[PDB]
Amino acid sequence: MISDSMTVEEIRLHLGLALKEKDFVVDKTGVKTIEIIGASFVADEPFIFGALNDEYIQRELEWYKSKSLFVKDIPGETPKIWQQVASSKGEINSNYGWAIWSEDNYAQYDMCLAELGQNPDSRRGIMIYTRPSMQFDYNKDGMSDFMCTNTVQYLIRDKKINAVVNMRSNDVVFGFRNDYAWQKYVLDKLVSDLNAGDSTRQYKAGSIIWNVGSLHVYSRHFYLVDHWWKTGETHISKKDYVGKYA
Amino acid sequence: MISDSMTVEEIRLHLGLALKEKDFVVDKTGVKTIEIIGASFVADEPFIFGALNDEYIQRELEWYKSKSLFVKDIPGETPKIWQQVASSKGEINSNYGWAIWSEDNYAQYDMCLAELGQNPDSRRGIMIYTRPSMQFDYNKDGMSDFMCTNTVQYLIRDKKINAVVNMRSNDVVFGFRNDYAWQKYVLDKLVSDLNAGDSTRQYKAGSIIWNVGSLHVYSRHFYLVDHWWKTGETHISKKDYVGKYA
């Protein structure tokens, strides 16, 4: 429950235990990962491991606001991971701004906003990112992009808007930090939009609960887990790192 | 995480505490509910409160296997709740057999089966019940049926198939017990289908993790919570009940 879920610090602990026990899972690409399966925690920090990168997150936000399904429209030089997963025409699925703001995904943000505006206690206030046809759309034109966020539900209780984020898959290092920033953005916008609609509502942002089928770290980031395991420091540069994982 | 989520017995405790503290939420129909928001627990029992009803569950299973979107096709006299939520033509959305077996919902079961058959470690093995167009489809032709199950993801680790059930809304009393029976059915079928595909796999059913945006009890069932709170008995007939909630 929202009231006492796991914290991010406890998520760190369990990832550390998974690495120390060598609880390894081979990836779709043949690499090792460690995982929490069925993860569920309150996102009480904006990152788990790694450094801040407000600048990349702002670029991704602008790409989301454009709703463009083409990775080249990401501001500046598009990251290599986006180039790799895109189709032969540069197209993807996981533009989250498209997911919640495009008419072609059935106006998720606006309909959730309207639902909660008419019934503050509604259990039907939700933004549905993925879609049944994703079973076939994830590799359209040779892309490799099976939507990672399934749904985000918004529940207003005691004048706080809580977000229940349901993801099938989330990378602990870049993924969570970028996706948290996005979900906090949408939550704050929804609070502001509802408050602007009626001054008697007086809502504030509540808790963001993170639910992930596979919350994982790739072997290329094991050094971050190991360094935190040994020192409590959530970040170290790869150059400075001294330890087992290169 | 799968390893130590809440148990059903702890879910009972928290619902009991919600009732004792009069933590009430008014329903879409003007009635009271108590809730766990962002519930996440291992379904280590097949019910929370209430009596067994294997016979109703078997009728619902047959209706799911028919994939019929019409409530009259439920075997026997269709329950009043199904008649109430159906459209002017008797139609609904939430036939879960349609959701996972119909071609019109993009072959969720078969595609999840194929995905896990080719990549046992896949994070993309999922059955997507709801859909973005649900923002408009939930009241087609005057029905009132916004799909309650969003997604169910299947993760095979250490030869155990775990199910991560993501629901926006679940009634503790009839809902959870019926829906648990269904999700356990699908999980066992998926295990059997994968094992029948290759005798080296040797999978077994793992844990079913239940994630619910609003896991709630309606006031008409508060007596069950209260009786359990006072006695530890998970069921009492309404006739036998003596206490505050009629």
Side-chain angles (χ1 to χ4, degrees):
Chain A
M1 45 183 330
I2 179 188
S3 323
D4 75 339
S5 312
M6 259 181 230
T7 65
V8 168
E9 178 76 359
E10 299 173 299
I11 287 287
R12 293 179 186 120
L13 187 76
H14 290 292
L15 293 168
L17 289 165
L19 180 59
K20 142 210 167 272
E21 289 297 309
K22 301 183 167 180
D23 196 20
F24 294 133
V25 174
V26 56
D27 188 75
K28 181 181 48 132
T29 63
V31 85
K32 298 205 232 307
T33 62
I34 56 172
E35 313 174 298
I36 299 172
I37 292 294
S40 186
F41 62 99
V42 169
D44 62 329
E45 304 186 46
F47 66 93
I48 299 166
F49 301 118
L52 273 277
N53 189 355
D54 285 354
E55 272 198 297
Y56 174 78
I57 287 171
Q58 174 53 24
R59 287 192 289 276
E60 195 162 74
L61 167 63
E62 283 307 315
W63 185 54
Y64 288 169
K65 301 205 282 217
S66 82
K67 309 182 275 180
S68 173
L69 294 172
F70 296 88
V71 299
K72 185 160 188 291
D73 280 321
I74 291 172
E77 180 174 20
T78 288
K80 157 82 139 199
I81 182 48
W82 277 116
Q83 304 175 343
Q84 292 174 195
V85 299
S87 84
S88 59
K89 301 170 191 144
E91 191 181 351
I92 43 73
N93 289 318
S94 292
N95 184 316
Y96 287 169
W98 179 93
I100 69 159
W101 291 317
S102 176
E103 286 176 11
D104 291 343
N105 206 44
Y106 298 91
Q108 295 303 304
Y109 181 89
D110 289 348
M111 283 309 106
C112 181
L113 172 60
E115 172 67 17
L116 292 167
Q118 58 153 12
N119 183 6
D121 305 301
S122 179
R123 303 175 295 246
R124 301 170 163 180
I126 188 165
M127 300 180 205
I128 299 161
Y129 285 52
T130 195
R131 54 179 181 267
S133 69
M134 190 58 47
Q135 300 290 351
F136 305 129
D137 296 344
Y138 74 93
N139 63 348
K140 177 180 96 175
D141 293 337
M143 72 180 64
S144 190
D145 182 10
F146 201 122
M147 188 100 48
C148 292
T149 303
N150 300 315
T151 55
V152 183
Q153 178 176 13
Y154 296 89
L155 287 149
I156 309 180
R157 301 294 185 267
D158 299 325
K159 259 108 159 61
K160 294 180 285 210
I161 312 199
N162 304 289
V164 185
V165 173
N166 159 230
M167 303 188 66
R168 76 174 176 82
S169 190
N170 201 210
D171 186 309
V172 162
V173 177
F174 315 126
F176 174 77
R177 169 208 78 193
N178 298 345
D179 293 339
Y180 176 88
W182 163 248
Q183 296 300 343
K184 180 58 178 157
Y185 176 92
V186 178
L187 181 56
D188 286 348
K189 185 190 185 68
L190 184 62
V191 172
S192 312
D193 277 351
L194 281 161
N195 280 339
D198 190 313
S199 55
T200 66
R201 285 162 180 164
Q202 301 165 31
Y203 300 146
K204 325 221 165 261
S207 299
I208 299 180
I209 310 182
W210 216 256
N211 301 281
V212 185
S214 167
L215 174 69
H216 49 85
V217 186
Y218 290 103
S219 60
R220 85 187 51 100
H221 293 309
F222 286 173
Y223 76 93
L224 285 172
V225 182
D226 183 56
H227 181 73
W228 175 85
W229 192 243
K230 296 166 165 174
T231 70
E233 285 167 15
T234 51
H235 169 265
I236 183 172
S237 93
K238 194 134 193 176
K239 318 170 95 154
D240 298 348
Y241 172 77
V242 177
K244 168 75 187 190
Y245 302 98
Chain B
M1 45 183 330
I2 179 188
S3 323
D4 75 339
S5 312
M6 259 181 230
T7 65
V8 168
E9 178 76 359
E10 299 173 299
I11 287 287
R12 293 179 186 120
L13 187 76
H14 290 292
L15 293 168
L17 289 165
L19 180 59
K20 142 210 167 272
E21 289 297 309
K22 301 183 167 180
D23 196 20
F24 294 133
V25 174
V26 56
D27 188 75
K28 181 181 48 132
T29 63
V31 85
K32 298 205 232 307
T33 62
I34 56 172
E35 313 174 298
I36 299 172
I37 292 294
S40 186
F41 62 99
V42 169
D44 62 329
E45 304 186 46
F47 66 93
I48 299 166
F49 301 118
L52 273 277
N53 189 355
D54 285 354
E55 272 198 297
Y56 174 78
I57 287 171
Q58 174 53 24
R59 287 192 289 276
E60 195 162 74
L61 167 63
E62 283 307 315
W63 185 54
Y64 288 169
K65 301 205 282 217
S66 82
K67 309 182 275 180
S68 173
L69 294 172
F70 296 88
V71 299
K72 185 160 188 291
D73 280 321
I74 291 172
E77 180 174 20
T78 288
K80 157 82 139 199
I81 182 48
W82 277 116
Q83 304 175 343
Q84 292 174 195
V85 299
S87 84
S88 59
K89 301 170 191 144
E91 191 181 351
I92 43 73
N93 289 318
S94 292
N95 184 316
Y96 287 169
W98 179 93
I100 69 159
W101 291 317
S102 176
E103 286 176 11
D104 291 343
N105 206 44
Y106 298 91
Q108 295 303 304
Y109 181 89
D110 289 348
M111 283 309 106
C112 181
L113 172 60
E115 172 67 17
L116 292 167
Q118 58 153 12
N119 183 6
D121 305 301
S122 179
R123 303 175 295 246
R124 301 170 163 180
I126 188 165
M127 300 180 205
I128 299 161
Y129 285 52
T130 195
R131 54 179 181 267
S133 69
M134 190 58 47
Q135 300 290 351
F136 305 129
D137 296 344
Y138 74 93
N139 63 348
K140 177 180 96 175
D141 293 337
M143 72 180 64
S144 190
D145 182 10
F146 201 122
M147 188 100 48
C148 292
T149 303
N150 300 315
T151 55
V152 183
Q153 178 176 13
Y154 296 89
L155 287 149
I156 309 180
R157 301 294 185 267
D158 299 325
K159 259 108 159 61
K160 294 180 285 210
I161 312 199
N162 304 289
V164 185
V165 173
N166 159 230
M167 303 188 66
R168 76 174 176 82
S169 190
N170 201 210
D171 186 309
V172 162
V173 177
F174 315 126
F176 174 77
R177 169 208 78 193
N178 298 345
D179 293 339
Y180 176 88
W182 163 248
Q183 296 300 343
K184 180 58 178 157
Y185 176 92
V186 178
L187 181 56
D188 286 348
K189 185 190 185 68
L190 184 62
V191 172
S192 312
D193 277 351
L194 281 161
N195 280 339
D198 190 313
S199 55
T200 66
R201 285 162 180 164
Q202 301 165 31
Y203 300 146
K204 325 221 165 261
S207 299
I208 299 180
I209 310 182
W210 216 256
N211 301 281
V212 185
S214 167
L215 174 69
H216 49 85
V217 186
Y218 290 103
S219 60
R220 85 187 51 100
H221 293 309
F222 286 173
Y223 76 93
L224 285 172
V225 182
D226 183 56
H227 181 73
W228 175 85
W229 192 243
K230 296 166 165 174
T231 70
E233 285 167 15
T234 51
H235 169 265
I236 183 172
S237 93
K238 194 134 193 176
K239 318 170 95 154
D240 298 348
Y241 172 77
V242 177
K244 168 75 187 190
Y245 302 98

